[PDB]
Amino acid sequence: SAQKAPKWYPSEDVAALKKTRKAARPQKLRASLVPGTVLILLAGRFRGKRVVYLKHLEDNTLLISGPFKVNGVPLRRVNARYVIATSTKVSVEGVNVEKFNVEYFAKEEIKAERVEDQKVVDKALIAEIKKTPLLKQYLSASFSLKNGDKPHMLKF
Amino acid sequence: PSRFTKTRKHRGHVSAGKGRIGKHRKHPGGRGMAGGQHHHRINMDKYHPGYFGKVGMRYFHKQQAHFWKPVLNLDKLWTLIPEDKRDQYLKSASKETAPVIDTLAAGYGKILGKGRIPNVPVIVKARFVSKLAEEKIRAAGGVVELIA
Amino acid sequence: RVKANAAKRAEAKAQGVAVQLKRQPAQPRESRIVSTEGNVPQTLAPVPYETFI
Amino acid sequence: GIDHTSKQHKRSGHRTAPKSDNVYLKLLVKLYTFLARRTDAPFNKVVLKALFLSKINRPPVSVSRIARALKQEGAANKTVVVVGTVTDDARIFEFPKTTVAALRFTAGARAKIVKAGGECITLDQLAVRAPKGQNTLILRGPRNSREAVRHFGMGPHKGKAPRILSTGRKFERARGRRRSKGFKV
Amino acid sequence: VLKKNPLKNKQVLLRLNPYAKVFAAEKLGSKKAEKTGTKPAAVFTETLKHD
Amino acid sequence: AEQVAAERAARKAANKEKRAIILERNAAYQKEYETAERNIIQAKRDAKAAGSYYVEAQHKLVFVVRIKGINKIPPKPRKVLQLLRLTRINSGTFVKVTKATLELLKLIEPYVAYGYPSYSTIRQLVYKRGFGKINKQRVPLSDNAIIEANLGKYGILSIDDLIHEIITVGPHFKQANNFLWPFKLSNPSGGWGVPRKFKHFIQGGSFGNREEFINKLVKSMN
RNA sequence: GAAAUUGUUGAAAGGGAAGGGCAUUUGAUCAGACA
RNA sequence: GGAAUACUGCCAGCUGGGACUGAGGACUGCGACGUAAGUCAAGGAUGCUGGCAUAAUGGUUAUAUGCCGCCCGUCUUGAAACACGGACCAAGGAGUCUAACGUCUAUGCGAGUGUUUGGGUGUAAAACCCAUACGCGUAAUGAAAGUGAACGUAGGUUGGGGCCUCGCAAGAGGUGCACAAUCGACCGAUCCUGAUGUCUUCGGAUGGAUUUGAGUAAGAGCAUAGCUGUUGGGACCCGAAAG
RNA sequence: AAAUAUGUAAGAAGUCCUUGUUACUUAAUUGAACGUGGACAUUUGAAUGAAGAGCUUUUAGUGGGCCAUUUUUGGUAAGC
Ligand SMILES: [Mg+2]
Ligand SMILES: [Mg+2]
Ligand SMILES: [Mg+2]
Ligand SMILES: [Mg+2]
Ligand SMILES: [Mg+2]
Ligand SMILES: [Mg+2]
Ligand SMILES: [Mg+2]
Ligand SMILES: [Mg+2]
Ligand SMILES: [Mg+2]
Ligand SMILES: [Mg+2]
Ligand SMILES: [Mg+2]
Ligand SMILES: [Mg+2]
Ligand SMILES: [Mg+2]
Ligand SMILES: [Mg+2]
Ligand SMILES: [Mg+2]
Ligand SMILES: [Mg+2]
Ligand SMILES: [Mg+2]
Ligand SMILES: [Mg+2]
Ligand SMILES: [Mg+2]
Ligand SMILES: [Mg+2]
Ligand SMILES: [Mg+2]
Ligand SMILES: [Mg+2]
Ligand SMILES: [Mg+2]
Ligand SMILES: [Mg+2]
Ligand SMILES: [Mg+2]
Ligand SMILES: [Mg+2]
Ligand SMILES: [Mg+2]
Ligand SMILES: [Mg+2]
Ligand SMILES: [Mg+2]
Ligand SMILES: [Mg+2]
Ligand SMILES: [Mg+2]
Ligand SMILES: [Mg+2]
Ligand SMILES: [Mg+2]
Ligand SMILES: [Mg+2]
Ligand SMILES: [Mg+2]
Ligand SMILES: [Mg+2]
Ligand SMILES: [Mg+2]
Ligand SMILES: [Mg+2]
Ligand SMILES: [Mg+2]
Ligand SMILES: [Mg+2]
Ligand SMILES: [Mg+2]
Ligand SMILES: [Mg+2]
Ligand SMILES: [Mg+2]
Ligand SMILES: [Mg+2]
Ligand SMILES: [Mg+2]
């Protein structure tokens, strides 16, 4: 032969994983994140868009809408660590939001269910936004760090 | 064989195990037994006391075998009978029939006394006996028969 | 110490044990209460430089 | 860093297996390490290591040194164990019976044991008869009767036997060996 | 395989020392002390403020 | 075959009896500790009432940590360091104070730092960094059964029994303390508080007996 | 038909040598592994 | 007079931001929470989602950049040295073999051991077989003539593994090889003693002595082989002026 | 007459009782030495430590040393 070969070969039997102890416990969001709070999106497609926080989905992400007819941002998933929770807030009591879960966002252009769900949610919000003046224009304008802006200083 | 030699292990190390300071030179002590009375004397006395000088008489033309006298203790003795014959003689320890052991024929010249033979009588024919060797032979009821 | 340790051995065992005859080093001292009675602290200070020769 | 109170990476210094290559000795070991692991019995732990010892530390036990040990009070029905060879001794005229468990018995030695109606047993036969080593007497040969130890510790006033080839007078007997030539040792 | 520090692991704290439970339940790290009113004799106060 | 739940419930029940004993003991100790601690407080107050002075019994227990590296150490202090088991930098041990160990602490003062440990720092030394010596082998004390296994002979079945037998300087302190492997502390976290370690504490360095200040140091190194 | 050493061609770097260590950019090149 | 506070210390008080690590691979332990069933952060990471499926990640390489980096070898207290050798490359190039040996080790046989001078024999420098000797060992001590190893369970005492007896165990007693310590006995030398006897000068029993030996006191050797070491040899390699 | 440095001791190889051996020694069964028999266990005789202690054989290299704090000789001194 070209090489002698071993006296011992490894067992090809692949073993079982030890029984791990890690419970998946729920994510408690920081006290600043409460439905109706306006958010600044820090990243992704809609980065710098000011947007309204609706529901906390079972996958840990946040549910927001623009409203769509204000800034062009639809009902959408967003990661709670890519968002800046502001102080300014609107009441979500008149928004339904129950319909919306992880499965609703499974990948599986726009489905007509969405175009309709977008109108029922946004109409409730816009009803509320109009109560407080300039809040609509605030939501239509993007956020940018200007010169001399010091994030570790600024109140939001 | 050479592949087990430690000089194979030394290849690549400059000095071959021989030291950088004091090297490996030809003959630093001198050659052979040189200096047994001078630089090598501490080793000569201690490890060889008595090496130097003479003692006693010279003997010109001294032929060994003049002095040939192999020595055999009673310690053995009986070993000079083949064991089959031997055991027959131990029992029936007697006069009138007692084993004749020719120790000259066995290659020995003197019988010494190391000790303890059984009480069986023996006839021991030898050239020389120690005094104790013979007393002991007698105490078993044997004798010594001087031969030459 | 041998004939002493023999004594307090017999004179203990015959009494019912409780010996402790190994030697121990100087231990730190216990607590104590020092009185001020007839003894008030006398306050001292460092003295200045003199010469006197 | 550690201020090292003792020499680091020091080997026990004691043999672990035999240095021997004899399969049977290796098998005998295999037996007695097992025995020594599971029996809590002093005899097996001792016997294990005796198998490791070199021909120097296994001096022969003579058949007469055996006969002696059975004359100890109450020792006559014990089985003597010699981890090593056993040699014949023509100097004893009466050898007792017993049963002798050794590594080897010389021709003459096993004869004299059997002629008296004794038993020569291999160490493994002894393990089966006495796993915990019951009723055994272990004998060691006279280690320091080698010719080599005569010359150990050679030096002034040690009485220790020079390393010499030819002997007689004229050989290392004069100056330093007697008061009349130089000094005496 | 991995040492767990009782001082931050409430599980391991309790595997040693069952008394940890009683201790915390009863506070006891904050135990409030007997309020007593002794005052020092003049000597102590005089010589403290002396020179 | 039994033992399935059989000697399971003979053991698990037997294990409850011990945790019962330990709980019952550690509760008494805590009474001991604070009543002893309050008695002293009130003694200092009673003595000031009567106009007298209460002097604390000088400390019987000391904790030493080697401050100095391995090399350039004279022989006599260097053996003492070994006999105190501080052979490596920032490794501490407990030492019971008598004249015969007091002279030892004198010989090594330039290489160590030591003082009077509080119950707190002993508790937090043993819990976090305490290890036992079992056939050498430096085993961590993560379960009270390790301690009872090798210290039960003397009493001492719990990690806190150890701690008690240490701080009180028990009758068995020798066996208790030698059982503990030398504590290996890290360098202090707030630094040393000094620009140069190798003068005395009084001189503004770190070495010698710093008394109760050994705790803030040791805590920053634990 | 090796090496020192030489010609050509291709590539690249070069403010008083060159070569080397850790690290990464850029260029060139390449293994493996997805399914 | 009554509080506050600072300072120092304690809490098995609560809680936020950040970093590195995730070794192990069924179960087995110690526990924690529950009325319970169950559950858990309790003897080492899992869950959910996404992207690329490629030179994306990674390796190699050249270059650039930050920091660092003196010429190797040698003798030397000390070398990068203003100490020596070395321009470059290939190929040669230095602890060998033999005689006789020490310690150790492996192996055969063991009071013995060693077939190989030789003979027998052979498929022929091999393998196989063997008589007589010889060697070393089994006796030592004296310059030598010479003499030559048990008072005794081959001794007493102390330690001594192991084994034996008792004890559930802890312990206790019994026996105790190797080894070690110590006091004795035996053989030779030296010195002293000098019985019974005698070719009246031979003979040297017997009992002794701060003397002395490389000795005895139930043998351990002989042979082959290996590393290391020793001596002689051109003797690790190259080198005189000379004779 | 110090400081530092240094010898010895801190038990089972110990302590006490009884009363054997001898040719030494005593006026002397006096002593000296070595013993037979008996009494007391690990708080059995200070601390701390002990990755154990003890022992044997054989062999390498080395046998130009140099530096620092302190003591210190010669020298005005010296990288002497
Ligand atoms: Mg789980
Ligand atoms: Mg949470
Ligand atoms: Mg050779
Ligand atoms: Mg080497
Ligand atoms: Mg080297
Ligand atoms: Mg060498
Ligand atoms: Mg050289
Ligand atoms: Mg030299
Ligand atoms: Mg001569
Ligand atoms: Mg000999
Ligand atoms: Mg001999
Ligand atoms: Mg300590
Ligand atoms: Mg800080
Ligand atoms: Mg910091
Ligand atoms: Mg500074
Ligand atoms: Mg820390
Ligand atoms: Mg050609
Ligand atoms: Mg490179
Ligand atoms: Mg490919
Ligand atoms: Mg590929
Ligand atoms: Mg944290
Ligand atoms: Mg893993
Ligand atoms: Mg690719
Ligand atoms: Mg790449
Ligand atoms: Mg590829
Ligand atoms: Mg290139
Ligand atoms: Mg540089
Ligand atoms: Mg020079
Ligand atoms: Mg220069
Ligand atoms: Mg030169
Ligand atoms: Mg040159
Ligand atoms: Mg070549
Ligand atoms: Mg031929
Ligand atoms: Mg034939
Ligand atoms: Mg013939
Ligand atoms: Mg001969
Ligand atoms: Mg002769
Ligand atoms: Mg010439
Ligand atoms: Mg000439
Ligand atoms: Mg001293
Ligand atoms: Mg200890
Ligand atoms: Mg140990
Ligand atoms: Mg030497
Ligand atoms: Mg030398
Ligand atoms: Mg010299």
mmCIF file of N, CA and C in Angstrom, chain C residues 11 18 24 28-29 31-32 47 50:
data_model
loop_
_atom_site.group_PDB
_atom_site.id
_atom_site.type_symbol
_atom_site.label_atom_id
_atom_site.label_comp_id
_atom_site.label_asym_id
_atom_site.label_seq_id
_atom_site.Cartn_x
_atom_site.Cartn_y
_atom_site.Cartn_z
ATOM 1 N N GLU C 11 -3.097 14.021 87.981
ATOM 2 C CA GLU C 11 -3.994 14.821 88.811
ATOM 3 C C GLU C 11 -5.190 15.363 88.033
ATOM 4 N N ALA C 18 -9.749 16.796 81.041
ATOM 5 C CA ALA C 18 -9.541 18.236 80.828
ATOM 6 C C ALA C 18 -8.104 18.707 81.097
ATOM 7 N N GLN C 24 1.822 26.729 74.304
ATOM 8 C CA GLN C 24 1.276 27.649 73.326
ATOM 9 C C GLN C 24 2.118 28.916 73.265
ATOM 10 N N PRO C 28 -2.176 37.121 71.486
ATOM 11 C CA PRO C 28 -2.582 38.517 71.663
ATOM 12 C C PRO C 28 -3.397 38.637 72.940
ATOM 13 N N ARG C 29 -3.281 39.791 73.588
ATOM 14 C CA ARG C 29 -3.969 39.986 74.854
ATOM 15 C C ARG C 29 -5.448 40.294 74.635
ATOM 16 N N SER C 31 -9.323 41.994 75.732
ATOM 17 C CA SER C 31 -9.795 43.345 75.964
ATOM 18 C C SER C 31 -9.650 43.683 77.438
ATOM 19 N N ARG C 32 -9.616 44.978 77.728
ATOM 20 C CA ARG C 32 -9.614 45.426 79.112
ATOM 21 C C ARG C 32 -10.170 46.841 79.172
ATOM 22 N N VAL C 47 8.853 68.853 71.706
ATOM 23 C CA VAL C 47 9.637 69.936 72.291
ATOM 24 C C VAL C 47 10.421 70.646 71.193
ATOM 25 N N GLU C 50 16.910 72.776 71.135
ATOM 26 C CA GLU C 50 17.815 73.431 72.069
ATOM 27 C C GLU C 50 19.244 73.045 71.708
#
